[PDB]
Design a protein around this ligand. Structure first.
Ligand SMILES: Nc1ncnc2c1ncn2[C@@H]1O[C@H](COP(=O)(O)OP(=O)(O)OP(=O)(O)O)[C@@H](O)[C@H]1O
Ligand SMILES: Nc1ncnc2c1ncn2[C@@H]1O[C@H](COP(=O)(O)OP(=O)(O)OP(=O)(O)O)[C@@H](O)[C@H]1O
Ligand SMILES: [Cl-]
Ligand SMILES: [Zn+2]
Ligand SMILES: [Zn+2]
Lengths: 69, 69
């Protein structure tokens, strides 16, 4: 089922690239409509980035959660 | 740049999973609006699937080509 190809890829994408800051914890994320938004940092590093005043690692990548547009 | 994260992932996705039929050639694809459609087979195997009458490997996965929905 092509939807399964997409699901399996997102699982892999989420697993193999951790937080861009601590490089260990997985990234924060949210689902919106038919898209998975994967933020660049885990929540701990994102909260800390606010405290230290660095926006360098702020950002996200959105992914369509199904095979067919 | 988050757009670069998306581009680099699609390059990797396209490279590491070849045609589902011959398992060697890269997949056929097309671009439509802001999406990359990656078909399940290379063109050679897809054309041959028409000749032999098998729809088993017909299908595709669409990918948003940018970081932001
Ligand atoms: N875990 C995270 N890692 C990296 N960037 C993040 C994370 N969580 C939020 N951001 C991004 O950091 C920026 C500041 O976040 P904040 O939530 O304070 O503002 P916002 O504009 O309300 O967020 P959004 O644009 O997502 O609605 C936003 O661009 C947000 O997307
Ligand atoms: N290289 C390929 N690998 C796997 N499936 C493919 C490939 N090329 C086309 N297909 C799919 O095979 C099916 C039959 O293709 P064909 O092009 O004959 O019909 P179509 O309905 O015009 O295609 P589409 O739905 O993409 O417009 C369609 O679902 C098409 O998406
Ligand atoms: Cl996607
Ligand atoms: Zn972190
Ligand atoms: Zn092939």
């Amino acid at each position: 089922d092509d939807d399964d190809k997409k699901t399996n890829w997102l699982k892999r994408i989420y697993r193999v690239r951790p937080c861009v800051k601590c490089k260990v914890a997985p990234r924060d994320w949210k689902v919106k409509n038919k898209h998975l938004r994967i933020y660049n940092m885990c929540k701990t590093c994102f909260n800390n980035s606010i405290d230290i005043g660095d926006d360098t690692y702020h950002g996200h990548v959105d992914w369509l959660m199904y095979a067919d547009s």
